[PDB]
Amino acid sequence: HHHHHRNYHLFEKVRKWAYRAIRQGWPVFSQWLDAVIQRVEMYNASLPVPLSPAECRAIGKSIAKYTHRKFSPEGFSAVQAARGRKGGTKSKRAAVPTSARSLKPWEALGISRATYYRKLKC
DNA sequence: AATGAGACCAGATAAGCCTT
DNA sequence: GATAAGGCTTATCTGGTCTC
């Protein structure tokens, strides 16, 4: 009797949580393994008909081996650099309203940008 | 000579990414 | 079974200069 639906639901919920949680301490493997199983157990206890503790361990072992092996601080930077690259690319800075460039005092002084700045070195 | 128009430094900083 | 929403990048900001 394999239980595909609840298994899924547990594997999907927890894996998403684990990707983020591993960064809180980078617990060494033996502790991380216990951590993730324990999160599988907390969701499981929610279901009207929870899976067995053995099944919880299996789904938990899976997430924890994958995530311990693939995740790392350098890892997180790489992701954040890739996203940040997309982000800086389609992002534009607007004029800041309280700046010389924006208030344009030369326009009010009758003269132009370049004359205003030449008259300041003096 | 002294302006303007514009291209230029070079340092700083918001916006935007993902999809929590 | 699948890969990271806060560390990071890019575009443009800025006060100034400088030719033509």
Side-chain angles (χ1 to χ4, degrees):
Chain A
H1 285 235
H2 320 246
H3 321 281
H4 305 282
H5 306 194
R6 292 168 277 179
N7 186 296
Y8 185 98
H9 172 259
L10 268 4
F11 169 73
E12 289 290 300
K13 251 285 195 258
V14 168
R15 82 181 161 91
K16 257 101 134 69
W17 159 92
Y19 301 145
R20 206 197 288 240
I22 203 173
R23 267 193 261 148
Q24 300 169 184
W26 294 101
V28 294
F29 180 72
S30 50
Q31 285 322 125
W32 181 231
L33 205 216
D34 292 343
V36 162
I37 298 178
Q38 168 166 262
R39 181 139 294 213
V40 181
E41 285 166 342
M42 170 209 62
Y43 296 113
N44 184 56
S46 283
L47 296 172
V49 192
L51 272 14
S52 88
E55 188 154 5
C56 291
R57 300 187 231 112
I59 120 88
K61 187 166 303 179
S62 192
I63 299 175
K65 289 146 68 70
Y66 185 96
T67 61
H68 213 254
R69 186 174 70 264
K70 308 180 148 235
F71 276 58
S72 69
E74 318 72 287
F76 189 50
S77 294
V79 177
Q80 293 279 252
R83 312 185 168 181
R85 159 162 287 98
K86 228 95 61 61
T89 295
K90 62 118 54 180
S91 86
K92 318 255 208 253
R93 264 194 101 162
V96 38
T98 78
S99 68
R101 219 142 173 145
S102 289
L103 268 12
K104 302 176 76 77
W106 47 89
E107 264 197 25
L109 258 64
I111 219 68
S112 76
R113 244 285 272 209
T115 293
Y116 182 77
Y117 279 114
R118 282 191 275 256
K119 278 184 191 282
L120 256 63
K121 290 158 78 79
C122 284

